[PDB]
């Protein structure tokens, strides 16, 4: 059995991971999260320890690897900006890592890992779970038998309620801006597709819209991304709809469905086999989202412009 | 279309009271949590505002009843502690409060409750559903046909991994103690059945188990309580359950670890048809609750000592 | 004896609060604060009740007001966007508040807290110690006696260590920004010399500095903020300063880096004499500062730029 | 320049801390605290750098030694229960450690401290200051140019008002329960001075209160410790006084109710002299023992008089 710590218990993402290392027969040893909502956890690992201290967890996991029962991987899944300093930790513990995203907030981060897991042998791996949907592996093959960049449109509103403007989600310093955090996975999708980002631009950066435009090596991107579900196009609306994705590919919708439950768990399973997302396949949509958060407003072409911004 | 607001929000048992104020067609005005995984709440109430902050909640609320908007009730799903205070906020709002159980830690509270209703002209109402359960009210109504006291074997046991000593849950101050914070369910049922205590004793008191005798009018009960999932029969143990709760009265037995889904549901129905659990119902439970936490142990004879215990 | 409550005792501006309140006869008779190095108070008040959570606090002092022994004020030390509820609180228990600058974050509130001292017969006070600072005092009666514009340059270094930056001082949410939550100080010292404001820019808005132009009524204003050390005039770091506070006025300059041992007593001295600070006074700085917040950057005109930003 | 990093900065203690790093020349590199009212470090450290978040502060911490500008000393100003896995982070770092009292909680950490300690060559200190208080170094001066057993009462109310029920201190799983948190001191002070306890009672531990009776290779012990003001005997109540520690040691009493001893310690802690796992081992498994053994009813000569 794989053995797994998991950070951040007690939140909304966590008991995805509880019936990922359920479903891939690991084992949870340890949790730690400063918040206490976790009984869940008795479902799935009625044995496991827990800790509300990061370094008495911590503490904890260096006993068991002294004595020869470390954990394999602390699967992590706190605010963002802990996500870098918790991968510190399992590398320091002789763990390898399994991060939700962003891996980290910053391009510089990286390579400091880059860095530690040669000095510890261990390795950073992270959820993009975007990369193992059937019809977004099915885009990436066609894509590969055809010439030429794609002009792409990428809309993603994901109506939150008034909880969101309280958490540490719209901190800039600790989510890294509503980019990062709603929009990671988008931008590292379009890395998958579509290669290294060659110009940036920022277009509208408000606290509920961010939009803009990216020349990547396959593609020319205008992109939209918003937390307010009045962007939702009105069919949808008038319907009481609250998001809405949308990825069209020269002009051509792609349809992903949102069904997929197991999603996490292939993550999961590609990570043990060997076939996980590390450093290098996560770099560029860090690299991206750094710019995203700290470039200047720029006046759009019309060309560059996307629809919804008028 | 009652309005409610609701207090501790991301904890365990904010979903069922969330699930009751749709099916009873309320309307979810306003939430407060320090704690901010609770983005569930937009699948039900995707509207609602949320504070994390009691003092800026309650200026929000008494803003809207000053306008003619003000809630109908409070509901209360903080910890055992701040049950208390957050039922005079809901007083001195203009709304009812239905607070989880316990429904206050201390009689000289319960007290002080009941002059404040007279003078703010409204209710405190509590969440018992033991009282709502199908097979208890049944066992009620078995009860009643019969003359004398009944002697009964009460066996509470709900298993909880390490993560509840992490939590406010095991600190005395905030849940009143195992007793309490578990217990209070059945001495309600108990007070309930069978009316008054007239005395009572504590056999046992551990980080894990409680118990003890209670002569009350209508019967004498051994009563053992644990979060130790050991306690629960090997039988049950076998195919992995954790929890145990059985009343056995005179030898007749009813298991009641079940059936709970929507029974938080009913008691907001009864609730709002005032036909709900007040302060004069809730009493006794309480004031035997707090006496079982002062109490030194005493050694029991062998007609007053629990089946657990030897 | 006036009896006093107070919120906000474990931080830095408390405690000379304690020494205020001690130093005009007055008692405190509870604190509330989530933190607890707070054992400064045996010093002052050795039997005060101390309090962790706000419900709690509150429903004491009701009870203290509901059997004739209130507190006549809640003098107010915490988070400035607690400011307006804590006021709020103060009122609808029947005491005055005394509170922290800014006295709230937004203008709308000043007309509701205007309202609720009708209702109530209670009011709102503010501590603004540069009011009673002597230096500043003396230069508003020079300036009493002359007509006509001034033309004023106004710096004001409060130097800040890296722990500044983890604070919620930098949380604009929470503090105002560094224009609300240092600034206040000198807009409102502004106001009180020169009145409204009839123009304001903002020319720099970073995390360590503020600086802008203003036109008020009677004069116009050259301003610059900073918790940058480093802004210090070089002539006084030589010196080991970490704070500079200046304002220039019509070939005068008057230095008020130091003289605030007692002001704070000052302040509670003239509020329990009925000369404090009251909404009237405290609305024109608060107006101004919540402009600077939302206001878009310009580029400022060569006359109207700060020499430090030169 | 030594170098520190400090944790617990926004409390209490912390400033004796900074007050002695100052001191002793050294640099405060940086800190550790979720709470941020620690302004004060400014006028100390005005360089120093500041995390609220365990993970990242240490992370940090390792970035300047893993390029040779590690720090030299973690002080640790935290909870009583942070102590261990603080000190762990210490050593881990390749840093010496200098924990408040108690140093950890339990006798099995000393042992694992022991370890540590060999593994990685650094040291773990302890404030002990009492050890180098003038008056109790001269108690114990006159008490070594005799033997026989000492015949001792020790009396040590603190008092301490309502917020102090609100505060860590007194949640015994984070402080270790009153004998721990306060009586650590005496404790300590009473193993320096007379060895090993052979026998331990104890006859009340209230919320409160918590007395009993110690044998120890060199005297026989009544002590009695309260956070309750109103045990300040009389004469010294009616003038309001809130603080009174003795110790008499066969009639005559020595008295160490009013106080620059943390700076002491540091300096001989970097001296070489300081007070290492050794010295800090014995008080720390009586407070374990007081803290889980059973109440008792004392024999009226083992009885405290306060009782
Ligand atoms: N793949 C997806 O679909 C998806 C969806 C949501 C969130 N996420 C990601 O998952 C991570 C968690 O987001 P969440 O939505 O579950 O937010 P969340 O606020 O609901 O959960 C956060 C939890 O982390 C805890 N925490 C805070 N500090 C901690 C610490 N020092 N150590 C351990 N735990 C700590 C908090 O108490 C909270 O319980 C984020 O990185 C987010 O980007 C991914
Ligand atoms: N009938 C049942 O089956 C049942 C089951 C569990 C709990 N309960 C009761 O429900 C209440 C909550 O129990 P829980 O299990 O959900 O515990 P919990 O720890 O999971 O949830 C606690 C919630 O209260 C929040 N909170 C803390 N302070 C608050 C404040 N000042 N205002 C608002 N919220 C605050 C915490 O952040 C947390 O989110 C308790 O009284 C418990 O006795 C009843
Ligand atoms: N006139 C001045 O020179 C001056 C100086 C500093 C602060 N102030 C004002 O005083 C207030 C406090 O500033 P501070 O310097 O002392 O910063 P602070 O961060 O040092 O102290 C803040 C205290 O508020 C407490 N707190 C948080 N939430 C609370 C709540 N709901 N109720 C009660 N207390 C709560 C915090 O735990 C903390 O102990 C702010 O308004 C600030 O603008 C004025
Ligand atoms: N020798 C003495 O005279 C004396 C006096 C007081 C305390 N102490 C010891 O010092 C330590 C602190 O006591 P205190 O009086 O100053 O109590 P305190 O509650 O005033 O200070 C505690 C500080 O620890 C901080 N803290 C909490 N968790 C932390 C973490 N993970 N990392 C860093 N800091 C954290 C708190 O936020 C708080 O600022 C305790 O061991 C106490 O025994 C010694
Ligand atoms: C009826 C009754 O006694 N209610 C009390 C009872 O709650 P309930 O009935 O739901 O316990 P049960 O185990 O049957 O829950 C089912 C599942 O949820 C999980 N569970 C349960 C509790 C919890 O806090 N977290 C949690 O995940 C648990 O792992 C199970 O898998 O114990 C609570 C507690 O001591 O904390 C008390 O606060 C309640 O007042
Ligand atoms: C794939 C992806 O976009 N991942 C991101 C995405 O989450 P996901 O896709 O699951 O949300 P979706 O809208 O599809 O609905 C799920 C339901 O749960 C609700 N939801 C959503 C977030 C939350 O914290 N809580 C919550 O209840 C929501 O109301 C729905 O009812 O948004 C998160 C966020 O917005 O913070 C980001 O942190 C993630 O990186
Ligand atoms: C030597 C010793 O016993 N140390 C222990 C002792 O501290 P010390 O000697 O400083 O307190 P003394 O009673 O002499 O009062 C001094 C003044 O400060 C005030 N004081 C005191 C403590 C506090 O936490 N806060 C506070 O303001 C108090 O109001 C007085 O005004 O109590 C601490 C505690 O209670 O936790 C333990 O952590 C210490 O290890
Ligand atoms: C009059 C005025 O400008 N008030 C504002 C001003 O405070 P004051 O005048 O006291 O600061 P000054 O620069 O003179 O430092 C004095 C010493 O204290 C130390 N100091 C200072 C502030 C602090 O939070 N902590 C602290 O330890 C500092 O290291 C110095 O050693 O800054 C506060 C803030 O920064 O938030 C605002 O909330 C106030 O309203
Ligand atoms: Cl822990
Ligand atoms: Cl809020
Ligand atoms: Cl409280
Ligand atoms: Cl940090």
Known sequence: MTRFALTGLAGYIAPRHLKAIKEVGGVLVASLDPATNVGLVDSFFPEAEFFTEPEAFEAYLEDLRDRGEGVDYLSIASPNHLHYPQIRMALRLGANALSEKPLVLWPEEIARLKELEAR??????????????????????????????????????????????????????????????????????????????????????????????????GARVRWFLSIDPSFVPEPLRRQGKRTYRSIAVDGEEVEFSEGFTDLHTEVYRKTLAGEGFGLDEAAEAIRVAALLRTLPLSQPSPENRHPFLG
Chains 1, 2, 3 share one sequence.
Do not use: C
């Not at 990436?140 to 109506?159: H, I, P, S």
């Not at 819209?209 to 990547?216: F, H, I, R």
């Open 120 to 217: 510890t042998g261990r390795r950073v791996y992270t959820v993009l779970q975007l990369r193992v949907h059937p019809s977004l592996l099915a885009l990436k093959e066609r894509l590969g038998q055809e010439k030429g960049a794609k002009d792409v449109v990428l809309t993603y509103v994901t109506g939150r309620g008034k909880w969101y403007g309280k958490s540490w989600k719209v901190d800039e310093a600790k989510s890294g801006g509503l980019a990062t955090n709603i929009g990671i996975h988008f931008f590292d999708l379009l890395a998958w597709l579509f290669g290294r980002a060659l110009h940036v631009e920022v277009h509208a950066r408000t606290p509920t819209v961010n939009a803009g435009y990216l020349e990547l090596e």
